[PDB]
């Protein structure tokens, strides 16, 4: 099991545009097209990224293609983040995977708002962290995924995912 297999399970496929949760134009594997509300730019966006006129319809190869870049794009923000990196390094493989998923999901920025929770991860207060983490909008917005992710951070294992 690994980050890739993980996100894939949390995100799902899609070859046609979609408004996620809080309705941003998303596609493929939880690949965000645009914050705006235009089916427009999303398509615009969509196209610059695929290097072609999608007219809103990608294939797998592509969706996966974006996917691999995304995952990859997330490790760097983490790495390029003065507040994430430190937590990241401190954690193990499985646990790192959860962090990445979070970030992949809400952004360097968004994740970094978990000041306390981040502090307990690096302090290793797994238990306190889970609770904390769960008492959030995130959890409230995506209870399931959110729970899978918390347990992982907490158990340090992949059990939530089988």
Give the SSE string. HEEEHHHHHHHH
Compute the CA-based radius of gyration. 16 Å
Spatial gap, N to C terminus: 10 Å
- For the secondary structure, the number of strands is 3
Largest sheet: 3 strands, antiparallel
Fraction of helical residues: 55-70%
- Choose one word for the global shape: elongated
* SSE-based structural type: mainly alpha
Strand order of the largest sheet: 1-2-3
Q: In CATH terms, what is the fold-level topology?
A: Lysozyme
Beta-strand portion reads 5-15%
Main location: host cell
Keywords: Antimicrobial, Bacteriolytic enzyme, Cytolysis, Glycosidase, Host cell lysis by virus, Host cytoplasm, Hydrolase, Viral release from host cell
Organism: Enterobacteria phage T4 (Bacteriophage T4)
GO molecular function, one term: lysozyme activity
Write the layout of secondary structure elements.
Blueprint: H1 3-11, E1 18-19, E2 25-27, E3 31-34, H2 39-50, H3 60-79, H4 85-90, H5 93-111, H6 115-123, H7 126-134, H8 137-141, H9 143-155
Antiparallel strand pairs: 1-2, 2-3
Helix pairs in contact: 3-5, 5-9, 6-7, 7-9
PDB class: hydrolase
Keywords: hydrolase (O-glycosyl), hydrolase
Assembly: monomeric
Could you describe the 3D structure shown?
- This protein is mainly alpha-helical and 162 residues long.
- It has a single domain, classed as Orthogonal Bundle (Lysozyme), CATH 1.10.530.
- 63% of the residues lie in helices and 6% in strands.
- It has a three-stranded antiparallel beta sheet with strand order 1-2-3.
- Strand 1 and strand 2 (25-27) form a beta hairpin.
- The longest helix has 20 residues, at 60-79.
- The relative contact order is 0.12.
């Amino acid at each position: 099991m690994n980050i890739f297999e993980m996100l894939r399970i949390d995100e799902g496929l899609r070859l046609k545009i979609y408004k996620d949760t809080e309705g941003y134009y998303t596609i493929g594997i939880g690949h965000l097209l645009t914050k705006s509300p235009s089916l427009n730019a999303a398509k615009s966006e969509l196209d610059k990224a695929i290097g072609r006129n999608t007219n809103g319809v990608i294939t797998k190869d592509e969706a996966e293609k974006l996917f691999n870049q995304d995952v990859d794009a997330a490790v760097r923000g983490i790495l390029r983040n003065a507040k994430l990196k430190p937590v990241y390094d401190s954690l193990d493989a499985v646990r790192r995977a959860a962090l990445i998923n979070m970030v992949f999901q809400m952004g360097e920025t968004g994740v970094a708002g978990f000041t306390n929770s981040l502090r307990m991860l690096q302090q290793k207060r797994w238990c306190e962290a889970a609770v904390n983490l769960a008492k959030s909008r995130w959890y409230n917005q995506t209870p399931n995924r959110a729970k899978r992710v918390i347990t992982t951070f907490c158990t340090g294992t992949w059990d939530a995912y089988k």
